[PDB]
Amino acid sequence: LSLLQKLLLAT
Amino acid sequence: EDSETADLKSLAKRIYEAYLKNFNMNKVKARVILSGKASNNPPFVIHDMETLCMAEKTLVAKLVANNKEAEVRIFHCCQCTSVETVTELTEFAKAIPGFANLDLNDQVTLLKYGVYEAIFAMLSSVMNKDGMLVAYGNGFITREFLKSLRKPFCDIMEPKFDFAMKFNALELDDSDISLFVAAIICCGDRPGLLNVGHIEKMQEGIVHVLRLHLQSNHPDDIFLFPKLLQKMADLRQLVTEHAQLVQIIKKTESDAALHPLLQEIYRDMY
Ligand SMILES: CC#CC[C@@H](C)[C@H](O)/C=C/[C@@H]1[C@H]2C/C(=C/CCCC(=O)O)C[C@H]2C[C@H]1O
């Protein structure tokens, strides 16, 4: 849900 | 035993590769540009308000197609640079064996507390005593110009320059720096970690690689590893004080909004 979580899942 | 040193050497190589693949700027590229042989078009030097407006018109025209105060426009550029570096560090981190296997929340935490330490460490590669490369190697902004900005903006970079002059005297190359950045990320004692025992082991593995690499790569400097250990503690304090300064800006400068990713990193940090 968080931007950092998203970055970490981005790839 | 040979199976182990072989794996340590291999791991050092793989982290060096992930670093070369993931970061747009490295110490070799920065020195080519700076040397500065032999890039066709040398960096625009930004040393005053006029050269700043010139560089802006050609290098980030959007931000001036409208305009905010010079110090704020520079702060915006700083943020965009940090956001991109944060993205680069995330991918580098996922290439470190075991990082991506961690609990998503432990990954977030290592990145949260690690990025700005890694960013100021890597910033050294683009800094000399006169200034620093900016805008993906296309500009060079002077230390004196930055000092000359009005408070509090003139207080941002000086401390980073001071760290860099000392870090740079160590004469590390990118193979050294990739490992240092890895050890900064894989740190068992970040606040709020879940699986601390496993991450401490991962940390110890990385530090082992770093220690041996420095032994091979710098046989002239037998204290190099304790020196780097200290630099890591210095980066911790440098980052604490940077965040304190960032909070002051956010609170007192009506026109300097923080990017959402960066507010998330700073929140509840220190
Ligand atoms: C024009 C111009 C210029 C200079 C910049 C483009 C230069 O490229 C920026 C380098 C910045 C430094 C200046 C900083 C300011 C803190 C605010 C953002 C944060 O808190 O992230 C933090 C440093 C990290 C690095 O991204």
Pocket test for ligand 1, best of B51, B69, B82 (most atoms within 8 A of CB): B82
Q: Judge contact between B228 and B179, C-beta under 8 A.
A: no
Nearest to A3 among B91, B107, B261 (CB): B261
Whether residue B261 and residue A4 make contact (CB cut-off 8 A), yes or no, is yes
Nearest CA in chain B to A8: B90
Count of helix runs (H) and strand runs (E) in chain B: 11, 3
| ∠ Cα B116 B117 B120 (to 5°) | 80
Alpha-carbon Rg for chain A in angstroms: 5
Domain range for residue B206? 1-270
Query: For residues B234 and B13, what is the distance between their CA atoms, to the nearest angstrom?
Result: 27
> And the tokens for B175?
């193979």
CA B105 to chain centre: 22
Closest among B233, B215, B235 to B225, alpha carbons compared: B215
Residues B194/B103, Cβ–Cβ less than 8 Å: yes
Whole-angstrom Cα distance, residue B222 to residue B210? 13
* Cβ neighbour number for residue B109 with a 10 Å cutoff: 20
Q: Is the dihedral of CA B168, B172, B173, B178 positive or negative?
A: negative
Indicate the residue type of B137.
G
The answer to whether B240 and B61 are in contact (CB under 8 A) is no
- Residues from chain B that touch A1, judged by Cβ atoms under 8 A, are none
The CA distances from residue B233 to B117, B219, B227, in Å, are: 10, 24, 10
Q: What is the DSSP string of B101-153?
A: GS-HHHHHHHHHHHHHHHHHHHHGGGB-SSEEEETTTTEEEEHHHHHTSPTTG
3-state secondary structure B24-78: CCCHHHHHHHHHCCCCCCCCEEECCHHHHHHHHHHHCHHHHCCCCCHHHHHHHHH
The HSE-up count of residue B202 (CA atoms within 13 Å, CB side) is 24
Resolution in A: 2.2
Tell me whether residues A8 and B264 touch, CB distance under 8 A: no
With beta carbons less than 8 A apart as the criterion, state whether B250 and B262 touch: no
Question: Is B19 known as a binding-site position?
Answer: no
CATH code, B102: 1.10.565.10
Task: Of B181, B184, B138, give the one whose Cα is nearest residue B45.
Answer: B138
DSSP classification of residue B170:
T
Q: Are strands B139-142 and B131-134 parallel, antiparallel or unpaired?
A: antiparallel
CB B22 within 8 A of CB B91: yes
Q: First-to-last CA distance in chain A?
A: 15
| Radius of gyration in angstroms for the set of CA atoms belonging to chain B, rounded to a whole number | 19
Length of chain A: 11
Tokens (6 digits) for B202: 């991962």
| B44-46 β-sheet, strand order | B44-46, B139-142, B131-134
The total number of structural domains that make up chain B: 1
Distances (CA, A) of B187 to B120, B129, B205, B206: 17, 31, 11, 10
Residues with a CB atom less than 6 Å from ligand 1: B 74-75, 77-79, 81-82, 85, 119, 123, 134, 141, 156-157, 246, 262
What distance in angstroms lies between residue B78's CA and the mean position of ligand 1's atoms?
3
Atom 7 of ligand 1: nearest residue by CA position: B78
